[PDB]
Design a binder for this molecule. Sequence first.
Ligand SMILES: O[C@@H]1[C@@H](O)[C@@H](O)OC[C@H]1O
Ligand SMILES: O[C@@H]1[C@@H](O)[C@H](O)OC[C@H]1O
Ligand SMILES: O[C@@H]1[C@@H](O)[C@H](O)OC[C@H]1O
Ligand SMILES: [Fe+2]
Length: 286
Amino acid sequence: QVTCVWDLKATLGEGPIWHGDTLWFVDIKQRKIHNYHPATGERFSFDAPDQVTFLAPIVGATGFVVGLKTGIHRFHPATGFSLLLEVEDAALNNRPNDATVDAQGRLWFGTMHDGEENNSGSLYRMDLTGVARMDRDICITNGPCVSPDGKTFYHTDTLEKTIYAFDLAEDGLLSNKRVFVQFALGDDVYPDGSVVDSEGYLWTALWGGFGAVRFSPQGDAVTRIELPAPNVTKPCFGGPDLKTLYFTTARKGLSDETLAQYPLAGGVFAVPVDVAGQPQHEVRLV
Ligand SMILES: O[C@@H]1[C@@H](O)[C@@H](O)OC[C@H]1O
Ligand SMILES: O[C@@H]1[C@@H](O)[C@H](O)OC[C@H]1O
Ligand SMILES: O[C@@H]1[C@@H](O)[C@H](O)OC[C@H]1O
Ligand SMILES: [Fe+2]
């Protein structure tokens, strides 16, 4: 049985990372940044001026790169949020979503239509050279991640239920886009966030799928973890050995009867696994 380590009941828990030997994540719709210490069970929360969608630590503990609906900001507990750059026109009614940091310190993050209807979202790569638009015309982007060897990049079109794979060159460009995995069975099962473990396997959390799936680098499902929560948003490897798989979940979109049957929905869950994950990388801004 899977254990819920924090009965947070978040509306849209998302973007978990393992940083400073603690778990950091967000509640997008409640505009919260949460921090959880597994060794003591202590929890901390910070209020955000708008929807906050991802966190990525910057080298030197100079804060996090975070995604607010108003743009990409820096967040530091002792200075708040300060605008780093607007990436899209506010008229699009877009907002950032998921993100990851590769082994070279680059921040890959996506945008999406906040109304979840228009194909106005894009994929961006933020590094020392600036911000480059890597893909476009995606309604809900999700789960950017790179393989441990750095040669493969994964990205998710959630509403199309598709996970694509790209060839990633050392210079940082994507090529040879192809469908990695397509979800067919499940009318209300959508792929949300994904990560890649130390062995190159893809862990994908299922929106409306009550858990997460582990895929071989060839695209075959090999393991499924089930949670007492209908909408699982993202996995994150943490713990002292990177073998404790945490999961964020969401109460958004669930009826009152479903939430009464699954009262732990929106909480943070943890499961021990056999394969360790990848260490968290930090964004290079200098
Ligand atoms: O690592 C840092 C963390 O300890 C806290 O201060 O938030 C800012 C981060 O950069
Ligand atoms: O809005 C949600 C988005 O934040 C999440 O990443 O994927 C599921 C969507 O419904
Ligand atoms: O799981 C339930 C929890 O969500 C609620 O808050 O307290 C009662 C528990 O049974
Ligand atoms: Fe997501």
